[PDB]
Amino acid sequence: ANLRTQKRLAASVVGVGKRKVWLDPNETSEIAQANSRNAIRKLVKNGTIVKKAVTVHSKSRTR
Amino acid sequence: ARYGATSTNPAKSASARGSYLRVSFKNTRETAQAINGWELTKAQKYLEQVLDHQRAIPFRRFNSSIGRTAQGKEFGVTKARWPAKSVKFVQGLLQNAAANAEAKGLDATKLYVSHIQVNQAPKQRRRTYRAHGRINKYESSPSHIELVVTEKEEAVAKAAEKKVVRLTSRQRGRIAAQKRIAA
Amino acid sequence: LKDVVTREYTINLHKRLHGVSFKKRAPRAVKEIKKFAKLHMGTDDVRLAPELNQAIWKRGVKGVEYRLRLRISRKRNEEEDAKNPLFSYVEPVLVASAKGLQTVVVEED
């Protein structure tokens, strides 16, 4: 499928960039059915679409 | 309809064609001439080997400044290539002609490609942008391909003309004298 | 026909990537692993695990390891009959060091 619009909606809904969204490759059919921001919010709530963690920039060496 | 110049039995023949195929005419001509006159299954197997780079299509006419290769040794040539797109189109047409032949009710094992010809389709043109603000052409040379596969028949005929003879009186006398002088 | 066998080998990638351009070392390592599996198992359909891809690309392009322990399992092919009835699958073998080990056939249980 083509989940570009799903990733864009998920980024705009969660509030992070597209680099931090995780669309699981097993629920591709349900993500493809998800065509609205409400359905994207449901997928985020039940954990199909996950917000990845921040890549750390540790300040220990400079401290 | 109205194929090229063929000399075969249409009752023992099947045909296929493809017009306005966006494939290079110079490569399809060599791909056709490589299999012209071949048995059908042998030609198909050879085309799959060409696609898998085990054998090559010899380039006879449109071959200037192409590279040399060892796989031309089969054909006594030094210049050969692997025109994959032309092989795809040609083997698709071969499959269509085999389907037409088995629909006609032909033997399907005596089938050899008797006729196959390629000629130039109308060009499909684009533009090229060259230095100092010039425009040139960037055109594809597509192909009309057609082929006729026929059943391999037996010996053609015998019993040539009567060959009427005209002999002078002197020649007749010589023949009669020899027939008298011998037994 | 027979020979669904699975083994563990050690590929010396150093002598295979000697002289290769730095930005092609890891893709050439992938291609040489495919060629190695074709040499040993005779199979042209070689599938590498993404874990093996990570083990190759763990140190960038030009940081490919010298020796790599591989598990190659020649499997019976499936899926809408293809060209070949056999396909090879290459897993990485987690180990401390890939040095000193010889190839061993592993039992399937």
Place this chain on the structure above:
RNA sequence: AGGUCGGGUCGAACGGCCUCUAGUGCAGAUCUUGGUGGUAGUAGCAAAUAUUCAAAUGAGAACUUUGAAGACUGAAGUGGG
């Protein structure tokens, strides 16, 4: 100079002779318009560090999507307006 017949193709008008008339005969003019070649499957498609693996879709995937990995722009950014 040209004319005539036969064969093939084609489908709707055309010729001989006596005269009249002219926008009346092409190989050229770096001629005009249009078309087509050899060159030639040739020159080439090489700036901007870099891509790889699996799965899905599909007739078909180096290039599409997802995931993973590796990278880059490096806030006088390849970002946001």
